[PDB]
Amino acid sequence: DDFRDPQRWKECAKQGKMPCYFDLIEENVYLTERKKNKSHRDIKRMQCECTPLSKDERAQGEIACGEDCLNRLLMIECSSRCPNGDYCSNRRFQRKQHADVEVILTEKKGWGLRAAKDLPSNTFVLEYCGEVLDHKEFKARVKEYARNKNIHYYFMALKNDEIIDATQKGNCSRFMNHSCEPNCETQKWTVNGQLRVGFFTTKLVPSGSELTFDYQFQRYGKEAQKCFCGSANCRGYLGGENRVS
């Protein structure tokens, strides 16, 4: 179904059986980056206090840096200088240890992803990556694009003054729908100092089940929208007349 190829096929904008209209993104690229971050000044290395063996695999062995590792409990992944080296199970964003996914039609509301096989709780699925916008640029791009009569606005505020844009370039984690019964959740991880977001599960998702998380209600303009899931308490509309951000 996905069939990612570099040759652009005949497909207008639906991103169905020919998702080759936009350009994919591997890592979120920055625009105005400067040496004004706590990257190598104070947080140089948050090494974990593990004492592994690595001399026993597939027989009475254990996976290094498990849930008893401090870094994992901290929402932080071990660095390249982990005592295990390459046997550390924390560097999942570096090794790109994603899970099986697929994009197909699942409802008239929009494209969505369904589980292909079993996927236990607390497992990395995909990553959110996109263009990170500046302060003066966000308020101008939003108003210039708001007049472009579009329904999807892939905007995510990483921090109070950093919004990530996946419109021009978006990875596989862009078609996910929303429902009032979240089976997944996002977590803010710190790898190599920089902050990164991910997508983990929370329950034993069966084979052939939807994969969506709870969005955060927010409005920018006067118009409003609603959902179409209808799980148990499908509110749809925003939580009142809110204006914060």
Partner 1 sequence: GGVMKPHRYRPGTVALREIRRYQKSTELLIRKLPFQRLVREIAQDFKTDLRFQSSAVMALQEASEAYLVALFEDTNLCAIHAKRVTIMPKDIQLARRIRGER
Q: Which of 211, 225, 234, 230 is nearest to 106 (CA)?
A: 211
For 80-205, list the strands marked E by DSSP: 103-105, 111-113, 124-127, 131-133, 155-159, 162-165, 184-185, 188-191, 194-201
Compare residues 202 and 231 and give the one whose CB is closer to partner 1. 202
Whether 172 has a binding-site annotation, put simply, is no
Compare residues 78 and 125 and give the one whose CB is closer to Zn ion. 78
216 binds, among Zn ion, partner 1, none (CB under 5 to 8 A by kind): partner 1
Is residue 177 a contact residue for Zn ion (CB under 5 A)?
A: no
| Strand partners of residue 4 | none
Binder among 24, 156, 158, 229 for Zn ion (CB under 5 A): 229
Q: Name the site residues for partner 1 (rule: CB under 8 A).
A: 42, 46, 70, 73-75, 151-153, 155-158, 163, 185-188, 197, 215-221, 223, 225, 238, 245
Q: Which of residues 60-79 bind Zn ion (CB under 5 A)?
A: 65, 69, 78
Q: Which of residues 12-51 bind Zn ion (CB under 5 A)?
A: 48, 50
Instruction: Enter the tokens of residue 111.
Output: 């494209």
Compare residues 72 and 98 and give the one whose CB is closer to partner 1. 72
- 71-78: long-range pairs with CB below 8 Å, 24+: 71/46, 74/46, 75/187, 75/188, 75/189, 75/190, 76/46, 76/189, 76/190, 76/191, 77/189, 77/190, 77/191, 78/47, 78/48
Q: How many residues touch Zn ion (CB under 5 A)?
A: 11
In the complex, the residues that contact Zn ion under the rule CB under 5 A are: 48, 50, 65, 69, 78, 82, 88, 90, 227, 229, 234
